[PDB]
Amino acid sequence: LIRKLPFQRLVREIAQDFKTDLRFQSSAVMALQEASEAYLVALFEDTNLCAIHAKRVTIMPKDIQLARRIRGE
Amino acid sequence: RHRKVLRDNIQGITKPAIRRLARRGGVKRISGLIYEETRGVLKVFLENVIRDAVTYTEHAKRKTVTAMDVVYALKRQGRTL
Amino acid sequence: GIDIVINHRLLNNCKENYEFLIKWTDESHLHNTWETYESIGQVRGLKRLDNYCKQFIIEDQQVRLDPYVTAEDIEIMDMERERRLDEFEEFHVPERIIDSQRASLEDGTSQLQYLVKWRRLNYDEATWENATDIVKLAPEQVKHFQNRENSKILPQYSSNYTSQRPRFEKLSVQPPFIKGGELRDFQLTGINWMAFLWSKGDNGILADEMGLGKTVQTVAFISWLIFARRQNGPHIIVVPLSTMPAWLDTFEKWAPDLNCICYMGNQKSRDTIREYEFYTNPKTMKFNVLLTTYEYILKDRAELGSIKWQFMAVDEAHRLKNAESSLYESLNSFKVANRMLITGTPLQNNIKELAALVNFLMPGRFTIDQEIDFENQDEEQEEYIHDLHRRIQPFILRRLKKDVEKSLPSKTERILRVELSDVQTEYYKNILTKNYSALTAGFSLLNIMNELKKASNHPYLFDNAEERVLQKFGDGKMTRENVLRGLIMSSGKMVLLDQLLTRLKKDGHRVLIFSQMVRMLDILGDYLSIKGINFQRLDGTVPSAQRRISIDHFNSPDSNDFVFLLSTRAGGLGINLMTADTVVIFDSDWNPQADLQAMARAHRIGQKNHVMVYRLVSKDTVEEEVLERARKKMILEYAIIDMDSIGESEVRALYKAILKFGNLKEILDELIADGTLPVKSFEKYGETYDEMMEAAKDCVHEEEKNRKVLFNFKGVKSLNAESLLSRVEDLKYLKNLINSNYKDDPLKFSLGNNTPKPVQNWSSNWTKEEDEKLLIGVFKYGYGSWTQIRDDPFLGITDKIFLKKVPGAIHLGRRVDYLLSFLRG
DNA sequence: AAACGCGGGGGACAGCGCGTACGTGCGTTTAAGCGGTGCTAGAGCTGTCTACGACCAATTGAGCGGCCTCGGCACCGGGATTCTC
DNA sequence: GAGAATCCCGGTGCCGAGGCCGCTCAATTGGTCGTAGACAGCTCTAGCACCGCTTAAACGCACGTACGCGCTGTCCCCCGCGTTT
Ligand SMILES: Nc1ncnc2c1ncn2[C@@H]1O[C@H](COP(=O)(O)OP(=O)(O)O)[C@@H](O)[C@H]1O
Ligand code: BEF
Ligand SMILES: [Mg+2]
């Protein structure tokens, strides 16, 4: 659901700050994709509960902050 | 002209993709503020998992990150999650 | 609906004053009309007009207002206006009638129509149009069209030779099939070699040196096999995109009779081609030839593999380097009787690649059959390479232009070594020293070789280096002068290039630039622009149409643009640049054959002065070792170097034929070849025709005996005397007189002083003119061809005659009987 | 200390109105996806040799357990200060 | 501004902490033996970067409606306080 090349660029850019000039297996990038998608989808399914609890229809960032607090991060 | 080159990486996650994810997450409507907010969260998640993955690969004196190292990072993250 | 608006003629100033030219979304390009805002009112698409209005406003305001805008910018604006107008006019010109249709309307009226493709559009955005208009717009095109479905050159009637190929003997001269010009002697010899090989059934390659005519040779070979052998099955040619226009043009020049299709473009376009062009009334195929590109192979192999192709070829075989190529796999999924590979150079970087190629030609036991690589120098490599040479030499046709064609001027190959600039030197040293700190303000060091390779030619490929020079001129960076100065001095090899280019500008040379890197080519093009030079680019960024017109323009003999600037990958292959005489290779590929191709694009047949090639190399850089890698690859060439029977169905077909055409024995070969008659001895059909003519005369004598109508042939009752005898003599008389005066053109015909009686109260008005046109129709198509007679639009009949409206086939027959009796009286 | 009863105040709940933001559609532009080009580095494998760890025995010192003594913390009471109505 | 609650100060009581002493067990020292790991070399997979070509996704702007937010009014419940269990 997220474009492969942009995500691979981003993950490489982030990795750069721990140590330069890492190479990556493509399967590792796919694993990162699947993990990140799963995490985001879960976080949305969670925060939607907070949104409907506040009797909203929209998601608002207050709700993300709340969710991240309650699950603990 | 050549000057049309530009760079910004984090925007590679963009509103249509975030929309798709939210719709998969059953969301009805979203404020625009969410787009930058979720990007922050996503960076932190990446930040943590990469830190583990690289630390595996450097302990093995590798130059290449493998899917095995990644999945061991996830097996730590999800249980610590 | 509003389609793109074309032009404007005399925001609120625009809306009040101007009228625009509106194309319509559901209508032909010729249906476009001038409209104002108040004329159009409000309708789907109006924002596009507003967007065009904004464009015109920015066009107007920048033209009028700004003293910072030069007269030259106004010239460029006029050049854009004309460049758009040229295409938008030529879109009126038809190029292919696709199909004929009959339409009936709630008016209570019927019309004939053509599906027509415009001269620069795909088959998507083809449209129906009224037949009796397009016939007067493009009578050449409609006649050329209707010849095709009138033709008998078809897979339906291609003669198979599944038992064995027929006899072949070397053809002494250009066969009369071939019309575009004169074959060269060596070209004819190549055709002979291909014919010889095909008569042995073998697949092969043509590898005569680049530009020696391979397109003409191949199309001629097709023409020979299709006409002489009657190998009229579906044939397929796979083509690198940039050359597709010239191929089609070559087809049109050398063998226009062969109907061919450019299966290309958007999905809907291809779908319409599959709908209307491929199949006879869904199957069997209405076309001789496909041209296509590898993209559409990989996409539509699902469809195209369905066809039982007779013959297949590829213009550039080297693209198939290895058996695992998805193209190689998918093409091997095709079913075809023979294959033919064309190349500039078969001997790519590894003998393994040639082994895969010949495996493509032949089953694996034909191949090298031993995968040991070519030794750099040893005994075993010598015996093995000479073994392979002796195996393969029969299957290669190759010739060198130096040997073949001493008329063409030679080439000089020269290399120029240039010292790095300061910025080049420091960047190079910094990447050599892995200096992440230095490159932080310069960075993906994961390919050191690539990074320093692109550094070595030019520093502005690193995104600060421009600012890193301009900021020490932080005001002058606004000036054209200091921008140019900094750019040119950035890179010593550019300083050299500019000096040489200036000398060639003085001396009136015409020059090609090649590079691998699109960013570099962009920088160099911007250099030309700020120097004010006239040039065109070509690479992957330009779709087919704009590149096609750019090549055409630069080939135009007036063309002011003296520089053309190309990628090696897209621009290296098959482009024709014999208006150029000079080449600069700004950098080289790892593969020498790419450089040979790029050179050869200038060194075509028809180039008429000696060409200079300069290769520019950064001295004391890795690329002069890449040159040694190229030489090491180059080394390889120096190593390898019933008929008596008649069936009742045939009796029927003959009887109908002679009822339409009289003494068929003139036409009769065509009547077999078009399948009207099953294949039998021509002599048998002749004698049985004469026999029944005599039997008809006898029947007339029996009528005379009776007074003073069916009769059988070989018991077949499907015959009568009087209709045949009268029809034969009448049609002979008509065709004789029409030839005798008119034959130069029967459209000249008129019945003249013979004044016929009118039609009796038909549902359609009729005159001597309608009679005359009908007679010309019956001459073109014979008696009783009533569908074709009515359909032919040059007769103007197509409205006037019906499929309970009064005149029909019986009335037409009686009218013809009267008209011919009166004229014969 | 918990349970039970009583009154008053505050919060929660609901409805309404208005404005802004979000969604949708259209048109245009750009980048991604797929295939191919080319090369080198790094992984992955194999073999050999050496040093380190494990095992065993003896010896010695420290740590653990018990006991005793003293100090610090908690609790209680009174007076002063702060916060709330 | 007054009343109640909280805080601070001083003394007493005791229990826990801290230290000392003795004995036993664990750690330390030394020697021997085996193998795992380290080091070196070789082979070839696969990753990195870029081009070509196509098509849809993205991106931008405009328009309209729905939802969110704020305000007002009413009713319920819970909190607080006192008494009894
Ligand atoms: N028989 C011929 N007579 C004259 N000119 C020819 C002939 N064959 C080819 N040419 C010239 O060669 C050019 C086409 O090059 P071509 O041989 O098609 O390239 P390639 O075959 O290498 O792809 C044309 O411009 C044409 O002038
Ligand atoms: F090789 Be040819 F000139 F295309
Ligand atoms: Mg070619």
Residue C52 CB partners (closer than 8 Å, separation 6+): C4, C5, C8, C20
Length of chain C: 825
Give the Cβ contact number of residue C621 at 10 Å: 20
Say if C445 is an interface residue toward chain A (CB within 8 Å).
yes
Contact list, A20 vs chain C (CB under 8 Å): 436, 445
Number of continuous H segments (helices) and E segments (strands) in chain C: 33, 19
**Cα C614 from Cα C503, distance rounded (Å):** 14
Q: Whose CA is nearest to atom 3 of ligand 2?
A: C211
- How far does the CA of B72 sit from the C1' of E26, in Å? 39
Find the radius of gyration of the CA atoms of chain B: 17
**Cα C778 from Cα C817, distance rounded (Å):** 12
CA of C96 to the centre of ligand 2 (A): 28
Structure tokens at C203: 């697949």
- C397 neighbors C190 (Cβ within 8 angstroms): yes
Length of chain A: 73
C210 annotated to bind ligand: yes
**Cα C663 from Cα C725, distance rounded (Å):** 10
Cβ separation of A23 and C446 shorter than 8 Å? yes
Structure tokens at B14: 């963009």
C447 touches strand D (CB under 7 A): yes
Contact list, B2 vs chain C (CB under 8 Å): 460, 519, 522-523, 526
Find the radius of gyration of the CA atoms of chain C: 34
- C358 neighbors C368 (Cβ within 8 angstroms): yes
C214 annotated to bind ligand: yes
Find the domain containing B54 and state its range.
3-81
SS3 of residue C174 by DSSP: coil
Structure tokens at C589: 């590929």
For helices C480-489 and C492-507, angle between their N-to-C axes, nearest 10 degrees: 110
**Cα C411 from Cα C582, distance rounded (Å):** 10
| Ligand with an atom nearest the CA of residue C578 | 1
C211 annotated to bind ligand: yes
DSSP string, C313-368: EES-GGG--STTSHHHHHHHTS-EEEEEEE-S-S--S-HHHHHHHHHHHS-GGGS-
**Cα C160 from Cα C176, distance rounded (Å):** 23
Separation in Å, CA of B2 to nearest CA in chain C: 6
DSSP string, C225-255: IIIII---S-EEEE--GGGHHHHHHHHHHH-
Q: Is ligand 2 within 6 A of the CB of residue C240?
A: no
CA angle C722, C723, C728 (to 5 degrees): 100
CA C88 and chain centroid, separation: 21
Residues pairing with C279 in the sheet = C285
Q: Which residues surround ligand 3, an ion (CB under 5 A)?
A: C 315, 574
Kindly list the protein residues whose Cβ atom lies closer than 6 A to any atom of ligand 1.
C 181, 183-184, 187, 210-211, 213-216, 574, 576, 604-606
Q: Which of C243, C247, C246, C245 has its CA nearest to residue C235?
A: C247
- C452 neighbors C435 (Cβ within 8 angstroms): no
Phi/psi at C646 (nearest 5 deg)? -135, 130
- C211 neighbors C603 (Cβ within 8 angstroms): yes
**Cα C462 from Cα C456, distance rounded (Å):** 11
For helices C592-600 and C623-640, angle between their N-to-C axes, nearest 10 degrees: 80
C735 annotated to bind ligand: no
Q: Which of C450, C452, C492, C496 has its CA nearest to residue C590?
A: C450
**Cα C519 from Cα C541, distance rounded (Å):** 11
- C490 neighbors C457 (Cβ within 8 angstroms): no
Give the Cβ contact number of residue A20 at 10 Å: 13
Atom of ligand 1 nearest to the CA of C217: 8
Give the Cβ contact number of residue C42 at 10 Å: 6
CA distance readout (Å), C184 to C181, C363, C395: 10, 34, 22
- C121 neighbors C106 (Cβ within 8 angstroms): no
B contact test, residue of C445, C446, C463, C537 with most B CBs within 10 A: C463
Nearest CB to C526: which of B1, B5, B7?
B1
Say if B20 is an interface residue toward chain A (CB within 8 Å).
yes
**Cα C528 from Cα C536, distance rounded (Å):** 10
**Cα C133 from Cα C276, distance rounded (Å):** 22
- C582 neighbors C611 (Cβ within 8 angstroms): yes
**Cα C790 from Cα C778, distance rounded (Å):** 10
Residues pairing with B66 in the sheet = none
Nearest CB to B54: which of A22, A37, A51?
A22
Contact list, C445 vs chain A (CB under 8 Å): 20-21
Q: Which domains does chain A have, with CATH numbers?
A: 1-73 (1.10.20.10)
Atom of ligand 2 nearest to the CA of C210: 1
User: A11: nearest CA in chain B?
Assistant: B46
| CATH label of the domain that carries residue B22 | 1.10.20.10
- C220 neighbors C178 (Cβ within 8 angstroms): yes
CA of C241 to the centre of ligand 3 (A): 10
DSSP string, chain B: -GGG----SGGGS-HHHHHHHHHHTT--EE-THHHHHHHHHHHHHHHHHHHHHHHHHHHTT-SEE-HHHHHHHHHHHHHH-
Phi/psi at C383 (nearest 5 deg)? -65, -40
Question: According to DSSP H, which parts of A1-73 are helical?
Answer: 4-16, 26-53, 61-71
User: B71: nearest CA in chain A?
Assistant: A31
**Cα C228 from Cα A26, distance rounded (Å):** 56
**Cα A66 from Cα C400, distance rounded (Å):** 78
**Cα C287 from Cα C306, distance rounded (Å):** 15
Nearest CB to B26: which of A18, A45, A61?
A45
Contact list, A16 vs chain C (CB under 8 Å): none
- C178 neighbors C157 (Cβ within 8 angstroms): no
As to burial, measured by CB atoms within 10 angstroms (0-12 exposed, 13-18 middle, 19+ buried), residue C41 is exposed
Q: Which of C277, C285, C286 has its CA nearest to residue C306?
A: C285
Contacts of C among chains (3+ CB pairs under 8 A) = A, B
Residue C233 CB partners (closer than 8 Å, separation 6+): C155, C158, C285, C308, C309, C310, C311, C337
CA of C251 to the centre of ligand 1 (A): 12
Give the Cβ contact number of residue C274 at 10 Å: 15
**Cα C116 from Cα C97, distance rounded (Å):** 4
Phi/psi at C710 (nearest 5 deg)? -65, 140
- How far does the CA of C51 sit from the C1' of D25, in Å? 16
Residues pairing with C585 in the sheet = C514, C615
Give the Cβ contact number of residue B63 at 10 Å: 11
Contacts of B among chains (3+ CB pairs under 8 A) = A, C
Which residue type, as a one-letter code, is found at position C626? V
Structure tokens at C678: 């099953």
Which residue type, as a one-letter code, is found at position C770? E
Which nucleotide's C1' sits nearest to the alpha carbon of B60? Answer: D43
For helices C518-530 and C492-507, angle between their N-to-C axes, nearest 10 degrees: 50
As to burial, measured by CB atoms within 10 angstroms (0-12 exposed, 13-18 middle, 19+ buried), residue C638 is exposed
CA of C609 to the centre of ligand 2 (A): 18
Contact list, C460 vs chain B (CB under 8 Å): 2
Contact list, B6 vs chain C (CB under 8 Å): none
**Cα C190 from Cα C186, distance rounded (Å):** 6
Method: cryo-EM
- C534 neighbors C544 (Cβ within 8 angstroms): no
CA of C255 to the centre of ligand 1 (A): 14
Which residue type, as a one-letter code, is found at position C719? L
Q: Is ligand 2 within 6 A of the CB of residue C599?
A: no
CA distance readout (Å), C181 to A12, C186, C696: 60, 15, 51
Q: Which helix (H) or strand (E) holds C112?
A: strand C109-118
**Cα C341 from Cα C813, distance rounded (Å):** 56
Q: How many domains does chain B have?
A: 1
Beta strands B64-65 and C19-24 are unpaired
Which residue type, as a one-letter code, is found at position C22? I
Phi/psi at B16 (nearest 5 deg)? -55, -40
Residues pairing with C720 in the sheet = C710
Atom of ligand 1 nearest to the CA of C211: 22
Residues pairing with C309 in the sheet = C336
- Strand E close residues, chain C 556-585, CB < 7 angstroms: 567-571
B29 touches strand E (CB under 7 A): yes
Say if A36 is an interface residue toward chain B (CB within 8 Å).
yes
Cβ separation of A23 and C445 shorter than 8 Å? no
